[PDB]
């Protein structure tokens, strides 16, 4: 857990940007006003996160989670008859 | 959302931290060093995103 002030984060900004992409751990910025606290995340890690919350907002993840424990059986994708 | 280079972001760094929270927008940092791209988001928005990832 790396937490830093906004002023020191500004002075180490280029090195913080390289840090999140090498360690894959976000940097937290905390200043005098807690409502301005921010997080720095690597772009590739952010892609996994955005895709996850998008599939959650559409209700897909709830279906995926329910289908994982529904005990309905599996069918090979070659045995699928598209005409039926 | 906003896409900007780290040099431009550093000139308005304090306003950047307020905008990601007040606008609930991700600000993407993308410069010439394309492998060091990142995103800056508000902490409260990040907490909600964390709770969404681990909700069943």
């Amino acid at each position: 857990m790396i937490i830093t002030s906004p002023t020191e984060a500004r002075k180490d900004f280029y090195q913080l940007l390289k840090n999140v992409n090498n360690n894959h751990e976000p940097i937290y910025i905390s200043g005098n006003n807690a409502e301005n606290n921010a997080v720095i995340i690597g772009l590739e890690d952010w892609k996994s996160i955005q895709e996850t919350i998008y599939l959650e907002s559409t209700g897909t993840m709830d279906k995926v989670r329910e289908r994982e424990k529904d005990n309905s059986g599996t069918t090979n994708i070659d045995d699928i008859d598209w005409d039926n | 959302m906003i896409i900007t280079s780290p040099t431009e972001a550093r000139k308005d760094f304090y306003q950047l931290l307020k905008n990601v929270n007040n606008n609930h927008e991700p600000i993407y940092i993308s410069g010439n060093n394309a492998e060091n791209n990142a995103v800056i988001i508000g902490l409260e928005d990040w907490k909600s995103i964390q709770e969404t990832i681990y909700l069943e």
Binding site: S57 | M1, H24, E25, G42, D45, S48, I49, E51
Partner: protein
């Protein structure tokens, strides 16, 4: 008790406010409301004119995931919130 605009919500959309409360988003939602009371067209909170433009529906962000969808009556200076929850459940 007095502001530039009257902010209201469709009663059928009040179901969204219960999900907002239990998600601890009430504070962020009320910040949207205060802006809607003062100026619903203010370029803040990721304000966006939804498509198609002629239907004049607008959107503001509670966070990255949820939005406040609303229309604005400019004659009566009233803001009609039609949605405050952007997840399917």
């Amino acid at each position: 008790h007095m502001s530039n605009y009257t902010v209201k919500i469709k009663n059928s959309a009040k179901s969204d406010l219960k999900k907002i409360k239990h998600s601890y988003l009430k504070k962020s939602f009320l910040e949207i409301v205060e802006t809607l009371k003062n100026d619903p067209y203010k370029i803040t909170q990721s304000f966006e004119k939804l498509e198609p433009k002629y239907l004049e529906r607008y959107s503001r962000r509670i966070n990255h995931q949820h939005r406040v969808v609303y229309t604005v009556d400019d004659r009566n200076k009233e803001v009609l919130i039609l949605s405050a929850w952007s997840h399917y459940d």
